[PDB]
UniProtKB/Swiss-Prot annotation, chain A:
Domain-related comment: TRPM4, is a temperature-sensitive ion channel, it adopts distinct conformations at different temperatures, markedly influencing where and how ligands interact with it. Decavanadate (a positive modulator), ATP (an inhibitor) and Ca(2+) bind to different locations of TRPM4 at physiological temperatures or at lower temperatures.
Disease linkage: Progressive familial heart block 1B: A cardiac bundle branch disorder characterized by progressive alteration of cardiac conduction through the His-Purkinje system, with a pattern of a right bundle-branch block and/or left anterior hemiblock occurring individually or together. It leads to complete atrio-ventricular block causing syncope and sudden death. Erythrokeratodermia variabilis et progressiva 6: A form of erythrokeratodermia variabilis et progressiva, a genodermatosis characterized by the coexistence of two independent skin lesions: transient erythema and hyperkeratosis that is usually localized but occasionally occurs in its generalized form. Clinical presentation varies significantly within a family and from one family to another. Palmoplantar keratoderma is present in around 50% of cases. EKVP6 inheritance is autosomal dominant.
This protein's encoding gene: TRPM4
Function: Calcium-activated selective cation channel that mediates membrane depolarization. While it is activated by increase in intracellular Ca(2+), it is impermeable to it. Mediates transport of monovalent cations (Na(+) > K(+) > Cs(+) > Li(+)), leading to depolarize the membrane. It thereby plays a central role in cadiomyocytes, neurons from entorhinal cortex, dorsal root and vomeronasal neurons, endocrine pancreas cells, kidney epithelial cells, cochlea hair cells etc.
Tissue and organ expression note: Widely expressed with a high expression in intestine and prostate. In brain, it is both expressed in whole cerebral arteries and isolated vascular smooth muscle cells. Prominently expressed in Purkinje fibers. Expressed at higher levels in T-helper 2 (Th2) cells as compared to T-helper 1 (Th1) cells. Expressed in keratocytes.
Lineage: Eukaryota, Metazoa, Chordata, Craniata, Vertebrata
Name of the protein: Transient receptor potential cation channel subfamily M member 4
Family of this protein: Belongs to the transient receptor (TC 1.A.4) family. LTrpC subfamily. TRPM4 sub-subfamily.
Assembly information from the UniProt record: Homotetramer.
PTM comment text: Phosphorylation by PKC leads to increase the sensitivity to Ca(2+).
């Protein structure tokens, strides 16, 4: 993978150019940003099915960037595992 | 009685034949290549032969593929 440390002042243009041209990721057909809580514990399994059999399954057809927390919190953890499963 | 029996099997003849085909293919997949009475050579060869993490990774990938489908 790739990683970067940057301040909140940074304008999105430089970061987008970095991702698209230096890291080599292609332009996405669509972008879905997932925001939520519940912190540590994993979500109820119907939310898990909504994430996997829903958002990720649909994004598999078009190709997409899925933006969320890059941490082991519950929502990001399940987004990552669903993306891995469909991968 | 014969006609009733015949109709029962003639209704599903392809299923019967494909099960039989599996059985036949399985039977001859492991038989020695020499036919009798020359099969004694293969039996003698077998007798002489006798008398003288990644896997689980692939398993998990295959099971994930199956569960997605």
């Amino acid at each position: 993978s790739n990683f970067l440390r940057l301040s909140d002042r940074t304008d999105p243009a430089a970061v987008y150019s970095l991702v698209t041209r230096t890291w080599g990721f292609r332009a996405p057909n669509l972008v879905v940003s997932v925001l939520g809580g519940s912190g540590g514990p994993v979500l109820q399994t119907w939310l898990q099915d909504l994430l996997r059999r829903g958002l990720v399954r649909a994004a598999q057809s078009t190709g997409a960037w899925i933006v969320t927390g890059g941490l082991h919190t519950g929502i990001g953890r399940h987004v990552g595992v669903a993306v891995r499963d469909h991968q | 009685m014969f006609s009733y029996t015949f109709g029962k099997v003639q209704g599903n003849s392809d299923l019967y034949w494909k099960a039989q085909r599996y059985r036949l293919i399985r039977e001859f997949h492991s038989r020695p290549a020499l036919a009798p009475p020359f099969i004694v050579i293969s039996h003698l060869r077998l007798l002489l032969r006798q008398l003288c993490y990644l896997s689980k990774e692939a398993e998990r990938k295959l099971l994930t593929w199956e569960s997605v489908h």
